[PDB]
Amino acid sequence: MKIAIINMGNNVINFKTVPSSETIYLFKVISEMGLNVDIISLKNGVYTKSFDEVDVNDYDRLIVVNSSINFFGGKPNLAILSAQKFMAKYKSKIYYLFTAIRLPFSQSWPNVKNRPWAYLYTEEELLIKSPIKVISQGINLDIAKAAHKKVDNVIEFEYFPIEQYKIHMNDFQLSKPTKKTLDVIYGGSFRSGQRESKMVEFLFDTGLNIEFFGNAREKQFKNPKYPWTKAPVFTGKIPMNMVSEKNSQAIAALIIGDKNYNDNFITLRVWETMASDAVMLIDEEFDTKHRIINDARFYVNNRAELIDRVNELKHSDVLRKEMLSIQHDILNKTRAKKAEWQDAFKKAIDL
Numbered sequence: 001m002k003i004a005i006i007n008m009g010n011n012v013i014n015f016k017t018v019p020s021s022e023t024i025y026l027f028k029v030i031s032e033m034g035l036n037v038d039i040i041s042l043k044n045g046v047y048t049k050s051f052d053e054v055d056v057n058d059y060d061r062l063i064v065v066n067s068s069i070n071f072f073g074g075k076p077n078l079a080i081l082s083a084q085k086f087m088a089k090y091k092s093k094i095y096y097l098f099t100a101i102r103l104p105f106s107q108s109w110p111n112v113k114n115r116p117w118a119y120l121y122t123e124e125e126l127l128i129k130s131p132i133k134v135i136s137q138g139i140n141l142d143i144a145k146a147a148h149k150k151v152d153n154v155i156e157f158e159y160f161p162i163e164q165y166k167i168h169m170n171d172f173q174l175s176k177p178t179k180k181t182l183d184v185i186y187g188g189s190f191r192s193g194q195r196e197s198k199m200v201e202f203l204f205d206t207g208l209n210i211e212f213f214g215n216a217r218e219k220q221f222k223n224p225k226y227p228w229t230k231a232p233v234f235t236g237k238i239p240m241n242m243v244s245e246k247n248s249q250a251i252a253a254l255i256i257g258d259k260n261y262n263d264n265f266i267t268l269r270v271w272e273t274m275a276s277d278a279v280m281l282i283d284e285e286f287d288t289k290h291r292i293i294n295d296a297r298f299y300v301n302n303r304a305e306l307i308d309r310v311n312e313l314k315h316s317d318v319l320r321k322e323m324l325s326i327q328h329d330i331l332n333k334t335r336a337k338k339a340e341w342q343d344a345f346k347k348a349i350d351l
């Protein structure tokens with residue numbers, strides 16, 4: 001029973017990019033699950049084997065982490081091309097991990113064929129014909145179906161909380177009490193639409209000492225629909241394996257909703273925040289039924305609530321430590337179901 005996992009459009013090497021990090025972490029939990037798996041990427045490396053040195057059919061299961069197939073600058077992207085070439089060669093069912101709503105499986109061929117460099121690839125090389133099973137991180141399978149209407153070889157859908165991969169790691173560790181230098185923190189990237197609207201709502205013009213780390217930049221928030229005067233401080237990106245420690249520098253860390261994610265997906269951020277030394281504050285819209293934690297104090301409806309909640313935390317160290325104690329307990333309750341999570345994953349990939 002040999003398993004192969006690949007990222008469909010991003011080179012995998014270390015934890016310096018989210019796509020690479022996610023692929024490696026998934027590789028790790030699958031291995032720790034007692035399964036034989038290899039990550040196949042562009043070149044051999046610490047965690048990977050290269051496409052050019054393995055036969056895709058020496059594997060019994062092919063797992064693919066979602067990615068975009070857009071060609072930056074209209075030029076060839078080997079990460080995308082080599083992965084799809086690998087996928088098109090596979091003759092069994094493909095398991096597509098849907099962790100980002102905007103990244104549904106898509107064929108690169110229709111795009112490539114009209115490129116000036118189309119001479120480099122044939123339809124047979126890139127056209128993926130194997131049946132595909134979408135493993136949706138979101139509980140709402142209709143959202144997954146809707147996103148995959150343009151591809152007809154996707155004939156199965158199943159929900160699985162993929163994002164719990166960090167908390168089930170053998171070396172997982174809660175963050176310890178950390179000296180506070182921030183009131184609120186958020187580590188991530190800029191995204192248009194509702195996410196943008198909400199980032200402005202919860203992180204801008206708050207009057208609090210807020211930091212936004214990651215790939216975001218103040219200049220990206222220029223939509224007249226979401227006006228702001230004072231922005232939070234933006235700092236650079238850090239490796240994914242240091243996110244919870246970074247979150248810990250703040251009194252509170254935020255979970256912000258987005259269209260189609262609300263009451264559907266639980267995102268990696270939820271666990272990274274819950275496991276940190278920062279109190280987890282959640283955008284009410286993201287989890288209206290309070291499925292994450294049945295305690296209203298961890299939820300903020302708007303900029304006003306956030307400000308008050310944060311002040312309440314700044315004014316009562318006991319309240320802060322109490323909420324941390326509770327979120328940490330709730331986190332471990334999910335961690336205690338590791339065996340169930342592992343069994344559900346195996347079932348998801350027909351094992």
Ligand SMILES: O=c1ccn([C@@H]2O[C@H](COP(=O)(O)OP(=O)(O)O[C@H]3O[C@H](CO)[C@@H](O)[C@H](O)[C@H]3O)[C@@H](O)[C@H]2O)c(=O)[nH]1
Pocket residue numbers: 017018022099100101137163187188189190213214215236237238239240241243265266267268269272
């Ligand atoms: O400096 C930074 C800041 C953030 N991150 C990571 O980036 C992740 C994603 O952040 P962001 O780009 O804002 O996307 P989200 O909307 O928070 O989450 C997306 O990415 C997650 C991880 O793939 C998935 O669980 C979600 O479903 C998907 O929407 C974070 O959780 C962190 O692990 C870093 O590695 N370095």
Ligand SMILES: [Cl-]
Pocket residue numbers: 100101102103
């Ligand atoms: Cl998305």
Ligand SMILES: [Cl-]
Pocket residue numbers: 240241242243244245272
């Ligand atoms: Cl981390």
